[PDB]
Homo-oligomer: 534 residues x 4
């Protein structure tokens, strides 16, 4: 609570220590779900893929290369210009852009369309045989709220969504029509186009890079490839070039991601767009790899490719100077960096059920169901703790005054009792805490047997009694509304959280299960709380 | 050059300043093409699209949303699952994936489609976590999309960047969608916000939740467009229909805000034509600074010997004063030997009445607003000299080196005398200076011009025996 | 609210449009302080200074220079090694590290200490004449909880804070003692030391940078300088160097901050640590400057300095090779970038009262004091709007049924009335909204006179009636607890927010004033709400 | 080299692959010191301290805290205003500012002090906003501080970096301080947290709020220290005493969390000695990769003519096969003319019985773990060749160039014959190869070693007439 700067200052100026110990008045008395870890801050988290893409950008920029956006969708004519003959071999592993035509409301489906009851479903409205032609002319998506909500009456799409379904079975015959447009397999396809417009107008050497998407087709399998991937690519345009330049770049580039040693082999493919005997395969050794559940135990992994563009394809775009091209594949580099083994599990994790809450996050989700509402009750429970926490080994029966005060304007006095005998006031597991560990919620007592759980897991700080106390603290305040005179709340054995006042939102509950987690909250809690609210 | 600690150490004990000035000895002597600005470092430069994208990731992260990558290639059955009965209207604007049939030609379209907007993949991604993770769920993703809207190039393009995000809680107003827009949009300058319900009323958005955010950015007021009032529609958002969520088993509602990147990118870096922005390499838009054009202007033939340098260095040293004396009139500038034989340098305007050096001996080359000029430093050209990048290379300077290296060719050719002369200056070659053939095709492309003209009228005779 | 995926799916599969319009059931009915802009997200913001420092780092790294941390506190002996004689001239503008000695509990203050009542304040405890010597030997701050809470009893520092004040008036005589340690004026001082250890062990050329603090003394004035500043510095070690290298770096460096043209002049100082005739002053032209409330209307501003280190000082550290040194001063570069005119106002803004809330942030802070609590009341007010919003021009008197329902289990019926006559049901300013504009809160009605305020400011969305309605909506629910039978809440004129149910936290209120803001909420609201809660 | 679009364009119309292979013609021919890895790009590298600092700024910003710069130089009257009666105990560990008195010598201490921790400046900064801005106030700042703790160097230093933050609200528990620690600390790997009340009970923190955060980081378990259990005290925090706030007029409480940077920096990049981290330039810690050492190993004298290259290029081409034939025995390798006169190259081991080339003609130079070795590629050295960076320069290779350039000196010296010979290899000069004098002082400093020894035993005679 806010205090008075003056007062606290004119009192401390004379008597300090007295003002000090007084500070405690400004703190806040938090209820039960107002304490750590029941309260916390949240922060956003990046995705390994996008992360690496960023690192990758900087990396490049840090070595001279300037950023650029290349043509993604291109006419396969370009590919056939970059492979001459071996072109087809590629276009098989590429994707073509197909697209739905328009409802041919003429000729073929027109003659036989004019030999039946043109229209029965009363709609009238002058022959809009032109408002339908402007469709076979040039329409789109946001154009339906024109030939309905402004044509045959009826708001937006309340009748337009079915008028085009019942009276127009036509639409349900459209079929996407392939074309010559393609989704570039690799970056290179677009480089020729872009380098085309500037290979000789800007000063040499030219250093350009671009980390963007590319689409490929390789045995429709999420495992053995993905339809789309990222390719951190670059091009080096200069008068004189050698495969060395390809290495020098590959080095300086990888070196900013750990890799400490590189080896370059000559690629067998010997692709057409690259000069003969320049398509190199670059291998880099990175520590994080040494000895792993992978095939790169020795640390070495092939991380990129590169070569010089054949003065052939270059001419196909009238590029006079030779050009170096390195092509780091992102997804891998990301796995190595962020430690993932399965491409698909890394990039698309939510889908592969790779979600996970932490011990601490689960502990934070375990709230207290029945919790007081009046400053009094907060003390009633706080107190029920004292007497029940101390007089735990009292050969029952036996009452014990816990609280003495006025609640809501009525004399209140609650006691901690026990009915049976030959036992103790409170059961043995009265001081059992809820510790989350290895993903399972537990209701155990501190021991030399449970250590592993209190030093590795994360304790919730709530003990059965601490949980119950709050339940009782509620009942008593209830009677303070029903103006009764005697409430004796009692709890026997514990089988779950419910039998402890604790609970967790349904979603965290489902998580636990989905994750093969386990909740274990049982034990003799036994401890009734007879109240005498006059 | 590497000096000696001790030597200089002790040398400083006697007379300090005599040793201090002694320091100038370690400084390297620079040739003409070795000093600023004919030498300079370089560095990468990011693209405004991408920059804005990263700038958007942080923005999102800064308001709590964690990143995720959504499906890009999808079976249209999804668009259908979401839009309900409006699904077909949409499938029009979307692309489809077609492949070539293996000839054991003509692409065979398939059921796959490139997402027309993030929302297509959202339902798919939220399907696996919506009821397993603790609420609220705040996810976002800035990735590529594919629309066919008229299949245009001018107005819009085939692929854009969506700056999407989704909020999954038990209770959601249209307000959460309002807050998220301001928090996100404010981190870019936008000061005032206005929302208007969208007429499109897309069927995947609970009826009457779909809104359109209008933001005010002072960077716009006065703009050469209809965004002068400062406001611009910058993003849309709505709340997913239970009809669609149900289709994927999402029990709780979901707020979805979408940000049109290329637009923001434009607002930020101030481009008018998206294409001229996202794709300037093609749309002729390419620039070099005057400072850059400058650096590229270099001395062609330059003295290849230690002496050669101190030769032309003198040639000028005299013209810088005797470029007056009524011609004819001869002056001596150098006295020494190179390679093996003694040498002397002469400078005179053999011709009749006039001055020794032409009226352009003191013309400096400077680049300005894209053109390469050859002009005298007169109180008339000031602005060219105070807004451009003066090469530092003057007519006589450009000339000298030519001679100082030309006599150097006779000195090794056994010859005894050479008469290097120079009258007018039709261009640069005439002033002994060049620019890589590429900056040249550049100047022209950027329809700039080179005006290096001038009556140098200066000849140099040298005798080596 | 969460719904059922099945139901909403098996109903939509058959009947769509019907399911659609049904969705609205899952949205949330927000109260009044649950609406925009009364609700919002918050995000952290960077400080121009630290910002530029970051940009600066990247900038450097982007041109080859590797990061390093240099000696901050150094023996002035170094300075005298870098200026030879002109050293003193510098050490005057530098700071020396002074430090409090120890309470000389011996000799001078010992003899006369043993001629009085050594100790009267009963404390006993064996002569700890050694526990006090270990102080004149080597003690610190966290050592008081040893010779009190573990010596003469008494917890932590309840008696230690005064026992050292009353019985020990000594301590109050300590005086910081100067030394030879200094806080480097500029980075250069530390470069010699660091370059010392590697100028010849690493490969040339060496490129190092460091953006760190430095302290200077210049006429104790916050305006004409500051005690501490930042200096983005770098050093270029190589065999052959020329002032050109200083320019080339200055260029490539500034070029990443806009500046498009540079001019370098020779510095008059002609400092000793720099070779004679190399200390250059670098001037750069940056657009953001063209025409401004500053002295840089022409766009040019002097942003950095640089020169070669005299082979003299270099030897003083046995550095064989020459070395280039550029020194961009941060604070300025930051002002130019983030547009600030006054150093002090920029770096230290909170202190110079340069705080500021926005129109939108103020609008967000205007909450509604009296707000309902039961789903019923929310409708009562919602309704009081309808009847009062429509029947606004009804020549009073005249009742108007607004709500008919059961609240908390009691028949409730409230009406919108008026007592006087010759007027209308609701006052003229009943539909006045609270628009924040130019920093002043306003209670005005939409007009062709107020446009400027509704299109430039930010409307709160609350109108007097909308405000009142919620007050009334509360009163009626109150009687539903006092089981009365008739409450007739009435509001006359409005003078402030209070007379409208609106309010703002005390801090935003003080902000307004401190900022010379103005609240204007007046006008004839007149509109009573007689309730008949049976 | 720049080719001709058309030429190659048409050339491809006939036989494609014949034109494709024709492409190899544009590739530049590289000299010995021009190919990898004797040529490579470089790039800046940030310092772990700073990195961590930035990494900390974002972390703070990501949990909502806005940045601010606090006063650094201050009048001790503040330390006093805050610590109340404990104020002096503190003033001990703090520094004071002293200046030189203008002689119209001996520094004159003053009342100014360099802040011992952020908190000193916090109260000052919060003083102006605590009651004017809307709550909660969340500020943070990562700046420099000055402590005198024993005035040590080993254990600690004179200046450290505090990663401070403050939370100003009407109600604050010790919990807010707990949450902020986890949110902040988690963004670095810390998984489990443990808090323990601090005994120090500093008087500026409400009695019994001052805590000490203990965080668990898997990156530690197994560490060669007492942080093996994985946990480490990583930060402290408390709630400002009303006694102190009052002194500055702050009505509401304030939570303050402090993060010891140099420590975090260490945990992250794994340094053990703070000084060896923050100040490695001094503490001898400086490294070069084998790949770097490599690049620095270059051919000293190399053929300065087009032919020269194809000469040594042949010299080796023969030794690569005839390094067997029982000596004496002579072979011819080159046949052509350079500069003007025809030339032929001879290779023979004049001496008696043995082989032509010594047993070290095929020794490649490779760098490994810091040493520069000269070794044969035998199934015995593998690891050196598969974990190090093989120069690619072999004994014969290193040799050849020497000769191919040595006959080049006779070819221009008018001479008629030269006999370049070579027996043992005591080092690199002997193999015609060098390393900048600085990498040399390096190898030694990093007490590494160079073992380039070997019996080359190969001589080359050449006759030009």
């Amino acid at each position: 609570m806010k205090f008075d700067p003056q007062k606290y200052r004119e009192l401390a100026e004379k008597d300090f220590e007295a003002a000090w110990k007084a500070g405690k008045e400004i703190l806040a008395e938090r209820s039960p779900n107002e304490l750590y870890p029941r309260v916390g801050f949240s922060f956003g988290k990046e995705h390994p893929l996008f992360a690496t893409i960023q690192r990758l950008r900087e990396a490049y920029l840090s070595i001279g290369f300037s950023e650029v956006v290349n043509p993604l969708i291109v006419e396969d004519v370009h590919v056939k210009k970059q492979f001459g003959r071996e072109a087809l071999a590629v276009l098989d592993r590429c994707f073509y852009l197909a697209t739905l035509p328009k409802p041919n409301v003429g000729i073929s489906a027109e003659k036989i369309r004019q030999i039946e009851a043109i229209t029965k479903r009363e709609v009238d409205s002058k022959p809009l045989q032109e408002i339908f032609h402007r469709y076979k002319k040039g329409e789109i998506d946001g154009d339906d709220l024109s030939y309905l909500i402004a044509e045959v009456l009826d708001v937006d799409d309340i009748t337009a969504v079915k008028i085009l379904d019942e009276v127009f079975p036509e639409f349900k015959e459209l079929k996407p029509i392939s074309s010559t447009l393609t989704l570039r397999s690799h970056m290179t396809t677009g480089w020729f186009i872009t380098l085309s417009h500037i290979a000789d107008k800007l000063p040499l050497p030219i250093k350009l890079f671009s980390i963007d998407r590319c689409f490929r087709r390789e045995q429709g399998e999420d495992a053995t490839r993905l339809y789309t991937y990222f390719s951190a690519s670059c091009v080096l345009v200069d008068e004189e070039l050698s495969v060395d330049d390809g290495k020098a770049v590959a080095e300086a580039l990888l070196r900013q991601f750990g890799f400490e040693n590189f080896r370059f082999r000559k690629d067998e493919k010997r692709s057409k767009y690259y000069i003969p005997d320049t398509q190199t395969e670059v291998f880099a050794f990175h520590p994080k790899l040494v000895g792993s559940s992978t095939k790169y135990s020795d640390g070495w992994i092939e991380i990129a490719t590169f070569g010089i563009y054949s003065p052939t394809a270059l001419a196909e775009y009238d590029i006079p100077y030779p050009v170096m091209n390195l092509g780091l594949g992102v997804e891998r580099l990301a796995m190595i960096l962020y430690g993932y083994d399965d491409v698909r599990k890394m990039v698309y994790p939510q889908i592969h059920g790779e979600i996970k809450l932490s011990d601490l996050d689960i502990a934070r989700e375990i709230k207290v169901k029945e919790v007081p509402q009046t400053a009094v009750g907060l003390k009633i429970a706080q107190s029920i703790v004292e007497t029940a926490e101390k007089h735990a080994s009292e050969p029952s029966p036996c009452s014990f005054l816990a609280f003495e005060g006025e609640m809501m304007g009525r004399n209140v006095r609650v006691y901690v009792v026990n009915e049976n005998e030959n036992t103790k006031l409170c059961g043995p597991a009265y001081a059992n805490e809820v510790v989350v560990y290895k993903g399972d919620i537990y209701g155990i007592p501190k021991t030399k047997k449970w250590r592993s759980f209190f030093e590795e897991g994360v304790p919730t700080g709530i003990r059965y009694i601490d949980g119950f106390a709050y339940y009782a603290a509620r009942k008593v305040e209830e009677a303070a509304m029903r103006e009764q005179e005697e409430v004796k709340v009692k709890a026997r054995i514990v089988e779950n959280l419910s039998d402890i006042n604790l609970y967790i939102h349904e979603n965290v509950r489902r998580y636990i299960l989905w994750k093969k987690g386990k909740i274990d909250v049982r034990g003799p809690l036994f401890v009734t709380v007879k109240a005498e609210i006059e």
